[PDB]
C-alpha cells in the first residue's frame, strides 16, 4: 500500500467534508 511512483493515491472519503474535489476522487 505504497503510492510513490504510482498514478492514484488513496484518499479516504471520511476527510472530504464538503470539498467537491475530495468527493470526486476519494475511496471508502
Amino acid at each position, epitope marked *: *500500500n*505504497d*503510492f*510513490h*511512483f*504510482e*498514478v*492514484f*493515491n*488513496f*484518499v*479516504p472519503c471520511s*476527510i*472530504c*467534508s464538503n*470539498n467537491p*474535489t*475530495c468527493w*470526486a*476522487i*476519494c475511496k471508502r
Partner: antibody
C-alpha cells in the same frame, strides 16, 4: 508516464511579483500534493511548501508566510506558486515536485517526480 | 522542525566506497529520502522510505540505519556519481526538512 512541466524563465524587478506554473500529466492530479522547493545559485534545496488539492490545504515554511501563495486548478491540472514583494535574494531555481500523504500508514511521502525548474531572477 | 545533519562534503577516490551520513533525533520514527542532484539537473529520488531503491537506480546505492543516523553508501564510486546528495524527512504534521546537501566529489 508522469510528467511535471514548469513555465519559463522570469526576470523581475525588486518589489514585483512572479507566478510559476506546474502542469501535470500521467496521474490522477487530485489525489497527490504538489511541493515547491527553491535553490539559490550555489546553495542547497529549500522547502517552500506544499498544497493538497482535495482539501485546498497548504503548508509553507515560516519564512514565506504572507509572501507566497500556492493554488491548484483541478480544471486544468495545474499548480501555481506566486511570490510577492520580490527581493534580490529571491533569485533561485524554483522546482515543483509530487508528494502525497499515505493515509493507510499515516506518513507524508518523498518527492518522486520533479519539474524541470523555473529560474526566477530578481534585479533592477 | 527537527534538524537533519549531513556533512557538507565527501571525497571518494574512483572505485572506492563513499558513505554519506544523515542524523536527526526524529529519524527513529520517520522515513529518510535521498536525492541526487548532478550539475545542471533537477534532483532525482534515489532512496525512499529509508531502504527502498527506485527501479533504474544503480545497485551500488544502498542505505542503512544505526541509531539516529542513516548512511547512504555508494559502493565502487563512478565518475558519474559526483553530485550533491540531499537527505530529507518529514514530521507527522507534514513539515518537510532537507539537510544542507553533501557535495560528493569523485576525486581522481
Amino acid at each position: 508516464q508522469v510528467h511535471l512541466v514548469q513555465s519559463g524563465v522570469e526576470v523581475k524587478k525588486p518589489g514585483a511579483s512572479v507566478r510559476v506554473s506546474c502542469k501535470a500529466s500521467g496521474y490522477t492530479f487530485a489525489t497527490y500534493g504538489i511541493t515547491w522547493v527553491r535553490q539559490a545559485p550555489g546553495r542547497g534545496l529549500e522547502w517552500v511548501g506544499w498544497i493538497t488539492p482535495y482539501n485546498d490545504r497548504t503548508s509553507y515554511a515560516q519564512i514565506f508566510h504572507g509572501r507566497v501563495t500556492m493554488t491548484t486548478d483541478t480544471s486544468t491540472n495545474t499548480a501555481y506558486m506566486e511570490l510577492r514583494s520580490l527581493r534580490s535574494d529571491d533569485t533561485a531555481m524554483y522546482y515543483c515536485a509530487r508528494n502525497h500523504c499515505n493515509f493507510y500508514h499515516d506518513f507524508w511521502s518523498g518527492l518522486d517526480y520533479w519539474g524541470q525548474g523555473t529560474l526566477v531572477s530578481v534585479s533592477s | 522542525s527537527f534538524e537533519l545533519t549531513q556533512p557538507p562534503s565527501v571525497s571518494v577516490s574512483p572505485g572506492q566506497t563513499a558513505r554519506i551520513t544523515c542524523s536527526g533525533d526524529a529519524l527513529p520514527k520517520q522515513y529518510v529520502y535521498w536525492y541526487q542532484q548532478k550539475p545542471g539537473q533537477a534532483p532525482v529520488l534515489v532512496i525512499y522510505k529509508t531502504t527502498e531503491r527506485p527501479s533504474g537506480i544503480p545497485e551500488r546505492f544502498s542505505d542503512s540505519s544505526s541509531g539516529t543516523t542513516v548512511t547512504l553508501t555508494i559502493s565502487a564510486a563512478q565518475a558519474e556519481d559526483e553530485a550533491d546528495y540531499y537527505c530529507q524527512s518529514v514530521d507527522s504534521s507534514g513539515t518537510y526538512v532537507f539537510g544542507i546537501g553533501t557535495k560528493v566529489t569523485v576525486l581522481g
